[PDB]
Paper text:
The endonuclease domain is at the N-terminus of the L protein, a multifunctional protein that includes the RNA-dependent RNA polymerase. The synthesis of mRNA in arenaviruses is a process that is primed by capped nucleotides that are ‘stolen’ from the cellular mRNA by the endonuclease domain in cooperation with other domains of the L protein. The L protein cleaves and snatches the native cellular mRNA cap structure through its endonuclease domain after ∼11 nucleotides, and uses it as a primer sequence for the RdRp domain of the L protein to synthesize the viral mRNA. The catalytic centre of the ENDO resides in the N-terminal part around Asp88 and should contain two Mg2+ (or Mn2+) ions, which are critical for the RNA-cleavage mechanism.
In this study, we decided to assess the impact of a key residue within the catalytic site but a priori not involved in the mechanism. For this, we mutated a conserved aspartate to alanine (D118A). From a structural point of view, we confirmed by crystallography that the mutation has no effect on the overall LCMV endonuclease structure, as preliminarily shown by the study of the thermal stability of ENDO-D118A by DSF. D88A is a mutation of the key residue supposedly involved in bivalent metal-ion coordination, while D118A is a mutation of a conserved residue distant from the active site in the vicinity of the catalytic pocket. (ii) Asp118 makes no direct or indirect interactions with the ions and has virtually no influence on the stability of the protein. This result was confirmed by our structural study (see §3.2). Any change in the hydration shell of proteins owing to changes in their structure affects the thermophoretic movement, which is used to determine binding affinities with high accuracy and sensitivity. The results summarized in Table 2 show that the affinities of ENDO-WT and ENDO-D118A for DPBA (1) are in the same (micromolar) range. ENDO-WT and ENDO-D118A displayed affinities in the low-micromolar range, while no interaction was detected for ENDO-D88A, confirming the earlier results.
Numbering used by the authors:
A (entry chain A): 0 to 188
B (entry chain B): 0 to 191
Write the structure that this text describes.
Amino acid sequence: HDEIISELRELCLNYIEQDERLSRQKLNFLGQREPRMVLIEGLKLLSRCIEIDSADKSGCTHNHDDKSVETILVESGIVCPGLPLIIPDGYKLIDNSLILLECFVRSTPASFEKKFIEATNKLACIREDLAVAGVTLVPIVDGRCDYDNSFMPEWANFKFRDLLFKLLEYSNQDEKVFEESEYFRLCES
Amino acid sequence: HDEIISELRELCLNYIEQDERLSRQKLNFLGQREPRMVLIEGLKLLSRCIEIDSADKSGCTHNHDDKSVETILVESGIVCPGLPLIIPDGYKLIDNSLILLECFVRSTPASFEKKFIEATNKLACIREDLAVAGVTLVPIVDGRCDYDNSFMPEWANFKFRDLLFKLLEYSNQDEKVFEESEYFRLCESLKT
Ligand SMILES: [Cl-]
Ligand code: NA
């Protein structure tokens, strides 16, 4: 397990592009010593790569600090009442128009379309609410089929995922050990 | 030497404050495996701590991407022709006033005063040039005697320096071992 963590460390430092927007998540990842924490922070790191890549391709700002739509508008001096908690992956307030980005990765066409319609409807629910406040919603849904991005070579991305999986099977092993769970739950009843 | 590198990595990750302006240099430091590179990146890391600390204490923005005075003014919509290439450690354009920061660390009073006068004169040379363009220079020279900064506890700063020194000692002894080799003869006889 320590060898896996060490391998994931070197891939992070040597094969993840030195973009400033990835720095914080790289450090969070590198600070983890516990296998399940390395796994979570590793998944979050790979996700940030994709989100940043999607923001760049969509011509908008990556939602670095996970601000909500309400927070985004407030900072630009726009008052918006009773709007759902939507945290976009990207955004850009340009003139009267608010670009909102939602990206995802789905491996099957069935799950891809289902998620595209969910993401489309999620952004669409705030259209009329924003228009009352004089804001024109520009909703972008970026659907992807793979976990590839411009910050990592294809082999490195694959190897990072292969190592995270090896780390997950060591964690799912502990989840299966919960044959002991049935005993202590029965020790209460 | 691998134990020293490991100790320095631990101090970097656990005892250097998680300020995002330090993130890039922390990663550059953490990526180094060669003792001489760990040392250089370690010194640069300690220097960024001081520069950022100096900018915070001086009430201005740390010059993260090493922009020039001309570049700083241009971004705020100010046209300025003849201007020497001056890259401050910090800056702030507020109103019609341009705050420019220069910080340093000197260990002896003689070197401290000499560097204070150099830094003062460096910023002063663009005073009239900036005024001829409507902007009032607010030049700040922040001289320091030690490496104390708000991003590291005193003990951690001390231990980081103590470990970097042990690395300097090892790395210059490997230079001595290398200087006895024949590759160093091909290295010195390299001019060409
Ligand atoms: Cl200096
Ligand atoms: Na200096």
